[PDB]
Amino acid sequence: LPAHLQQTFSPEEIQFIVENEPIKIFPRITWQLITTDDKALNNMVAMRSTEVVLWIALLLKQQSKCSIVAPQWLTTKELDRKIQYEKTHPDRFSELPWNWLVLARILFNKAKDDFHDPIHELRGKIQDLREIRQIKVLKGLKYLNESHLQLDNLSLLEINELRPFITEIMDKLREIHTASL
Amino acid sequence: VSPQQDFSDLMKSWKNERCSPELLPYPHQLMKRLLNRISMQSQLIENISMGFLDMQNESKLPLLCMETELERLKFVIRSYIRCRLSKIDKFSLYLRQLNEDENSLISLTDLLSKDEIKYHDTHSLIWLKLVNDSILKYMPEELQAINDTEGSVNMIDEPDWNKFVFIHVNGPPDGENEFGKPCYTVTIPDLKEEVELTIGSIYVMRYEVIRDLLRDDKVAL
Amino acid sequence: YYDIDDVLADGTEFPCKFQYDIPGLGYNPGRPITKNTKLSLPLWLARILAIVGPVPFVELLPPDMFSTKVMNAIKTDPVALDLHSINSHFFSLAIKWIMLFSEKELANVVSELLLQRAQELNHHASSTSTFLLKLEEMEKEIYKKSHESYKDTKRWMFK
Amino acid sequence: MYGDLGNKLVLEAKRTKQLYARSNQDVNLPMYHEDIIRNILKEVSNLRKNTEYLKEQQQLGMLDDKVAKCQYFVTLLCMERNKRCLLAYQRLRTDILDSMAWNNNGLDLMSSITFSQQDTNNLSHQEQEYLKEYCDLITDLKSGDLVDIDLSGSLVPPSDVFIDVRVLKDAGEIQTEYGVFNLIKDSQFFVRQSDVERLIQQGYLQKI
Amino acid sequence: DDDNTEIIKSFKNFILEFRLDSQFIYRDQLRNNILVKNYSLTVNMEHLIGYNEDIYKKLSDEPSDIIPLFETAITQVAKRISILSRNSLPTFQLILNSNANQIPLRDLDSEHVSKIVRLSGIIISTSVLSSRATYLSIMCRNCRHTTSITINNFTVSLPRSCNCGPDPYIIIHESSKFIDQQFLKLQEIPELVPVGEMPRNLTMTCDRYLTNKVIPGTRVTIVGIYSIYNSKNGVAIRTPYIKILGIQSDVETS
């Protein structure tokens, strides 16, 4: 009996999910281990980038034995083209990593000192792109009908927050209408 | 056949499970090779952890890594089955009516786990036994049977195939079902005209129209 | 069904008059109930009495809640309308009465009202005041679920 | 007036959902109502008694009247109504219950079901037999796996993966499994998630 | 007025960039306020003075010439949040409640006039609501000049220029935007410092969203500016009142 939530995912569970996405790293180190699902790696070379899963990068970052790379889409100069492209298409939600909220929480807790110009900038940027996008969702949510919605490109977290609401009142709405014919 | 793939399919199954309004087939072919695999590595790590003390008159890292990993994947399936058992708790009756009927596919050794089937029958049994000495004594003659009257109803519910589920469309293109302009799939709702479906965009609809896409894993939930 | 909202929804009284005489009154010393007597009946029994008959046992006189004055007043300002006062059940209830009498006209009406509440309820989904007091019980329950998803996702957002 | 006692009963059922909702979930159900449902059962027995009586009366006096049908129809519904109440309440009670048997048993080394569920004897023994039979039912699921499970625990995913537990007036040391953590009031153990899951449910650990 | 641009730029930069680790308390205070349709903002001075000492240096200097540039400064922000384009959105009221140092009622004598003063007293009775104006159109009796006057706060005579004269300007009430006002009157607490004399009561004007916030008889702690009005009753003898921004009742009080 899962109790909470249960129909929607838990906010934590979507991080539990996203940490399964691989991203590049800069190992300080120069057994085996096969583990199960990793496939990697031959002993990591210091000052050499390589591709590994996230939860291990985070794990090895707590010990500061590795320096995570910043994603090419996580930058303020990069985000600028994205909010510029977002203000100008009030309908569509543009192009999203789909994890961007949760990576934006996770990579800022520890890895923060690795980013170039992380301070007081990107958080200001993504807290914004997580603003106009949210209100655009609430103003795109007036057009609700059964059964269709284009939620286009939308974050996993954004999906998860509003899920019970939409997929509940769709189940009051479509419920009268299917049944009245 | 690769480990990583069995895992991706495990995650896929887990999400598809917590999303959908109803139960899904029990995937034994994989889940059992993982239930053997973890029995292997859990023994292996305790063995290497115990052999490690012999070189001791170094690096705990691959051991810590490994162990954390095993905690994560031993969480995953435990969420899975702890969920399915709940949906069995809700659908016990429906499943019973599904079992007494011939068509189409009953519980068997497939639709439920060889472990789950026990949970089902025993829970069902002790439940009926509870309500039996509690409120049916004192037993209405028409209400002797737990099943449709009909109305209202009962249960029956809830094989609800119309409920909404967020769906994200993914799968290999041949260039099967792609009719353009962007891509697969149909759709053809009964009440409405096709949208139809675009692959780079998540589209929420009923579970019933998409159940076949779900079977093919052409759309994630 | 097992959920409390439905079995409570069936508890509500309706002004339904009898088509026929029925001696053996179970309600008191009639003994029969004279034809065309208007007696309030809960929905649970009154639901299949309109079907079984080829003339049904009851007329199904439209409930005061569905009075065309109301179905008109809900087309003005739903967001400021107080549902919790009138029944309080509406959607749990109205959903049954639309099928029972097979009325199309008001579907398009309530299907609108419930969008208009909800475009307001995604507004109190962000972290009450007085308004929370005037929701219908089931609608209210959805407010719990949404507000909880949001609260929890905010508490996850930081530490 | 006819079937309304059930509406009041489920109305009361609702408030336990209110107490399980926000909530906070401590369990502590007030009591199972045996009395009010006894009233319901006496009322329904009344009903079915008049039902078989009139079922005898159609055989003689009523002579298959068109009106007769109604009694076997309407009053029959009432039986169903009580049922609709009686199960709706009851399942609700099993929902508030089995989940409790889930999240805590309880947990290592269960090792027995005791001191849990403050309702205890106040809740009906008819439910408690179901309950003990149910945790006996879940012991078999515990015995199929070979995970290991620990199914009862770890609803919330491990991170990362070591935590810090601050003692909360617990004695101690009762940590026999794996190692003797030597429980000591006012002592925080920089211990992994493993034994933390198991020990936090009991009430020893406090800050994760 | 490039200086007002310079001040308002600093207020925007105070709302958008403020970080309590790591949520932006104000910026979300704003959103969560427009959604419920509260149209208000509550600044916490300690955060303010933490952010820049400067803007609090001026805000405790000449409050009544500045605070409205802070209002327009924040509503120009809600334009970029609550909506997006390429209405109508009233300029939000700000309510600032902060610790400072309690200044008892007896100890208010001149010298701090037009300097923000936190204090504490039991409200006697609340005066019946009446509207002031915010934005009102005006037409001339003769040349019919259509003038939209934005009246601000914190009395203000109408302009006489487009015979014509002396004051040919009519208030159009069909387009005029109005707010509300209260007039609390507060008697200082009986514990201190009555001595042998009846305690004095300073007259206070609440407005907009603080109105009807407080049941008469409940202890409170007001913040607000301190200022004087004329009200012919010489010479000159102007009488004292406390504008309130913004009020905070004592624990809890709900």
| D195 and D140 together in one domain | no
Residue C55 makes CB contacts below 8 A (sequence gap 6+) with C19
d(CA A176, CA A170): 10
- Identify the CATH number of the domain in which residue B52 sits: 1.20.58.1030
State how many domains chain B has.
Answer: 2
The length of chain D in residues reads 208
Same domain, D120 and D172: no
In angstroms, the CA C20 to CA C33 distance is: 9
Q: Are residues B143 and B72 in the same domain?
A: yes
CB pairs under 8 A between A and B: 98
Q: E97, E248 in Cβ contact below 8 A?
A: yes
The answer to whether residues B100 and B87 touch, using CB atoms and an 8 Å cutoff, is: no
Distance CA D134, CA D150 (A): 17
Q: Are C60 and C100 in contact (CB under 8 A)?
A: yes
For residues D102 and A2, what is the distance between their CA atoms, to the nearest angstrom? Answer: 9
The one-character DSSP state at B166 is: -
In sequence order, what are the residues at sequence separation of 6 or more whose Cβ sits closer than 8 angstroms to the Cβ of residue A45?
A27, A30
**Single-letter amino acid code for the residue at B197:** L
- Residues D16, D119 share a domain: yes
Q: D68-103 and D4-21 helices cross at what angle (nearest 10)?
A: 20
Using a CB–CB cutoff of 8 Å, tell me whether A155 touches chain C: no
The helix (run of H) or strand (run of E) holding residue E204 is strand E201-205
The alpha-carbon gap from B39 to the nearest alpha carbon of chain D, in Å, equals 7
How far is residue A177 CA from its own chain's centroid? 35
D129 shares a domain with D161: no
Where helices occur in chain C by DSSP H, the ranges are 4-9, 43-49, 68-73, 91-101, 105-121, 137-157
Instruction: Please judge whether D99 and A3 are an interchain contact, meaning their C-beta atoms are less than 8 angstroms apart.
Output: yes
Interface residue A175 vs chain C (CB under 8 A): yes
Q: Buried b / exposed e across D137-175, counting CB within 10 Å, b at 16+?
A: bbeebbebbebebbbbbbbebbbbbebebebeebeeebb
Q: Does B66 touch chain C (CB under 8 A)?
A: no
Measured between alpha carbons, how far is residue E153 from residues E67, E94, E134 in Å?
A: 9, 12, 9
For residue E246, give the nearest of E128, E70, E76, E81 by alpha carbon: E70
Q: Are D195 and D157 in contact (CB under 8 A)?
A: no
SS3 per residue for chain D: CCCHHHHHHHHHHHHHHHHHHCCCCCCCCCCCCCHHHHHHHHHHHHHHHHHHHHHHHHHHHHCCCCCHHHHHHHHHHHHHHHHHHHHHHHHHHHHHHHHHHHHCCCCCCCCCCCCCCCCCCCCCHHHHHHHHHHHHHHHHHHHHCCCCCCCCCCCCCCCCCEEEEECCCCCCCCCCCCCCCCCCCCCEEEEEHHHHHHHHCCCCCCCC
Q: Which amino acid would we find at residue A67?
A: S
Give the closest of E21, E22, E32 to C126, CB-based. E32
Contact call for C126 and E23, based on CB within 8 A = no
**Judgement on whether residues D24 and D116 belong to the same structural domain of the protein:** yes
> Residue ranges per domain, chain C?
1-159
Tokens of D188: 């925080």
- Please answer whether residues E132 and E206 qualify as being in contact, where contact means their C-beta atoms are separated by less than 8 angstroms: no
Domain final residue pick, B109, B125, B157: B157
B114 and B142 inside one domain = yes
Give D35→chain B minimum CA distance, Å. Answer: 13
Q: Mutation test of the interface with chain D: which of C1, C4, C132, C148, choosing the one with the most D Cβ atoms within 10 A?
A: C4
Q: Given strand A66-68, what is the order of strands in its sheet?
A: A50-53, A22-27, A66-68
Residue in chain C nearest D94 by alpha carbon = C2
Rounded to a whole number of angstroms, the distance from the CA of E16 to the nearest CA of chain A is: 7
Partners of chain B (3+ Cβ pairs below 8 A): A, C, D
Say whether both B185 and B151 belong to one domain: no
Are B153 and B179 found together in one domain?
no
Long-range contacts of C152-156 (CB under 8 A, 24+ apart): C152/A5, C152/A10, C152/A11, C153/A11, C153/A157, C153/A160, C153/A161, C154/C127, C155/A11, C156/A11, C156/A12, C156/A15, C156/A105
Axis crossing angle, helix D68-103 with helix D35-57, rounded to the nearest 10? 150
Q: Which two tokens stand for residue E61?
A: 């200097």
Which residues on adjacent β-strands are paired with residue E219? Answer: E122
Tokens describing residue C68: 């065309």
The answer to whether B93 contacts chain C (CB < 8 Å) is no
CB neighbours of residue C2 within 10 Å: 17
Count: domains in chain A: 1
Helix (H, G, I), strand (E, B) or coil at E54: helix
Residue type for D117, please?
Answer: Q
Is B68 within 8 Å of chain C by CB? no
Is the bond preceding A137 in cis, omega lying within 30 degrees of 0? no
User: Which residue, chain included where needed, has tokens 């003898």?
Assistant: E237
Domain of residue D57, residue span: 1-154
Q: How does E202-237 read in b/e, with b if 16+ C-beta sit within 10 Å?
A: bebbbbbbbbebbeeeeebebbbbbbeeeeeeeeee
Residue A127 to residue E17, Cβ atoms within 8 A: no
Rounded CA separation B10/B33 (Å)? 11
Nearest CA in chain B to A32: B62
Q: Which domain holds residue B183?
A: 158-221
d(CA D76, CA B172): 57
Is residue D30 domain-shared with residue D91, that is, in the same domain? yes
Together in a domain, D4 and D73: yes
Q: Using the beta-carbon criterion (under 8 Å), do A132 and E27 form an inter-chain contact?
A: no
Using CA atoms, how far apart are residues B121 and B124, in angstroms rounded to an integer? 5
Q: Which residues on chain A place their C-beta less than 8 Å from a C-beta of chain B?
A: 1-2, 6-7, 9, 16-17, 20, 31-33, 35-39, 55-56, 59-60, 63, 65, 147-154, 159, 163, 166-167, 170-171, 174, 178, 181
Token pair for residue E154? 């914190």
Flag if B155 and C48 touch (Cβ within 8 Å): no
On whether the CB atoms of residues D113 and D37 are closer than 8 A, the answer is no
Taking the C-alpha atoms of residue C85 and residue B16, their distance in angstroms, rounded to an integer, is: 41
- Residues A157, A134: Cα–Cα separation, whole Å: 11
Shortest CA gap C85–chain A (Å): 21
Return the biggest CA–CA distance within chain D: 84
Residues B129, B185 within the same domain: no
CB spacing of B89 vs D141 below 8 angstroms: no
Q: What is the resolution of this structure in A?
A: 3.7
Instruction: Name the H helices within B20-60.
Output: 28-51
Question: Where do we find the tokens 């692959």?
Answer: B199
B102 and B74 inside one domain: yes
CA distance D36 to E49: 64
Q: If DSSP codes are grouped into helix, strand and coil, which group holds residue B63?
A: helix
Chains near C, with 3+ CB pairs < 8 A? Answer: A, B, D, E
Answer yes or no: do D114 and D55 share one domain: yes
Residues B36, B131: one domain? yes
* Share of chain E residues as helix, strand and coil, in percent rounded to the nearest 5: 25, 25, 50
Of B102, B133, B157, the position where a domain reaches its end is B157
Instruction: Please state, in angstroms and rounded to a whole number, the distance separating the CA atoms of residues D202 and D104.
Output: 8
Distance separating alpha carbons of residues B170 and B217, to the nearest angstrom: 8
Q: Which residues pair with C21 in a beta bridge?
A: none
User: Minimal CA–CA distance to A152: which of A173, A133, A172?
Assistant: A133
Q: In D, which residues are within 8 Å of A55 by CB distance?
A: 160
Structure tokens at E224: 């607000």
Q: Output DSSP code: residue E160.
A: -
Picking from B81, B123, B142, the nearest residue to D76 by CB comes out as B142
Q: Give residues 180 to 219 of E whose Cβ lies within 8 Å of C.
A: none
Chains with 3+ CB–CB pairs under 8 A to D are A, B, C
Parent domain of A40: 1-181
Alpha carbon dihedral A37, A42, A47, A49, in 10-degree steps, equals -40
Q: Which CATH class is domain C1-159?
A: mainly alpha
Residues 6+ apart with CB under 8 A from C69: none
Contact status, residue B153 vs residue C47, Cβ threshold 8 Å: no
Question: What per-residue string of b and e applies to C79-107 under the rule 16 or more CB within 10 Å gives b?
Answer: eebebbebbbbbbbbbbbbbebeeeeebb
Chain C residue with CA closest to A12: the answer is: C156
Closest CA to D11 of C9, B136, C1, C45: C9
Domain count, chain D: 2
Residues B28 and B122 both lie in one domain: yes
Whether A19 and A55 have beta carbons less than 8 Å apart is answered as yes
B110 and B217 inside one domain: no
Closest CB to A1: pick one of D98, D156, D160. Answer: D98
Do B86 and B42 share a domain, yes or no?
Answer: yes
Q: Which amino acid is at B144?
A: Q
Tokens of A158: 């954004």
The span from the CA of B133 to the CA of B154, in Å, is 21
Phi, psi of D2 (to 5 degrees): -75, -60
User: Is D207:D165 a contact under the CB 8 Å cutoff?
Assistant: yes
Distance CA E105, CA C158 (A): 42
